[PDB]
């Protein structure tokens, strides 16, 4: 997360860290006691041996796994979205099952899933969170980073991202002048919008031209467009 600030313990109880061979590489969001929604390019080409993935919940400081509110789970199964296209960076989303259930605490909670036709209009301010790079090609964070970003219209995003095909399964966010954006190491992490006291999973950090650059919004997988596929796994 670039241009963000250090979040405190419990701020985002649904945000989870993912480790591949004990190496933190992506974020994901808890949506039940058993499943996590993350990005497909996180597990692409390394999804056949699921126990090689670790999900760390209730985490705060990446340099501190000793906190008593943390819980670790091995990944039982990884279900990449059937239409993921690495070349097109389209449908960058994936389900991950925790071998063992987690126990909901004040530091571990599921994020609400948006309605299928939940509208996220431009100007709408939302939040991104992750332990990724603090600047492009820079070092990742320790304290979980958080940031607020305004959503764009796909029309406007396609505009600033001519080198890509902004599909209806994507949603973008970011400032015209740049400064705040999701970066490497944040993929799989959420893009959340509070809808009346409740936080909804709007997007899934997917891709974008570098990070925090002006008129170069971060692209996310538009969750409302996958809300049914996701809820089918629920249990």
């Amino acid at each position: 997360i670039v241009g963000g600030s250090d979040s405190r313990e419990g701020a985002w109880p649904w945000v989870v860290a993912l480790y591949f061979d004990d190496q933190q590489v992506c974020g994901a969001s808890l949506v039940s006691r058993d499943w996590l929604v993350s990005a497909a390019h996180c597990v692409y080409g390394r999804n056949m041996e699921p126990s090689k993935w670790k999900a760390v919940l209730g985490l705060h400081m990446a340099s501190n796994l000793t906190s008593p509110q943390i819980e670790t789970r091995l990944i039982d199964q990884i279900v990449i979205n059937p239409h993921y296209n690495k070349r097109r960076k389209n449908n960058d989303i994936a389900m991950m099952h925790l071998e063992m259930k987690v126990n909901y605490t004040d530091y571990i909670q599921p994020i609400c899933l948006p309605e299928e036709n939940q509208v996220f209009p431009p100007g709408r301010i939302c939040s991104i969170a992750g332990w990724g790079a603090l600047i492009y090609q820079g070092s990742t964070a320790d304290v979980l980073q958080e940031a607020d970003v305004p959503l764009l219209s796909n029309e406007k995003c396609q505009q600033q991202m001519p080198e890509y095909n902004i599909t209806e399964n994507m949603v973008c966010a970011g400032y015209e002048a740049g400064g705040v954006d999701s970066c490497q190491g944040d993929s799989g992490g959420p893009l959340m919008c509070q809808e009346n006291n409740r936080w909804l999973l709007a997007g899934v950090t997917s891709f974008g031209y570098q990070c925090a650059l002006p008129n170069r919004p971060g692209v996310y997988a538009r969750v409302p467009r996958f809300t049914e596929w996701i809820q089918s796994f629920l249990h």
Partner: peptide
């Protein structure tokens, strides 16, 4: 669901 629980 979607609620922060820390003061």
């Amino acid at each position: 669901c979607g609620k922060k629980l820390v003061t």
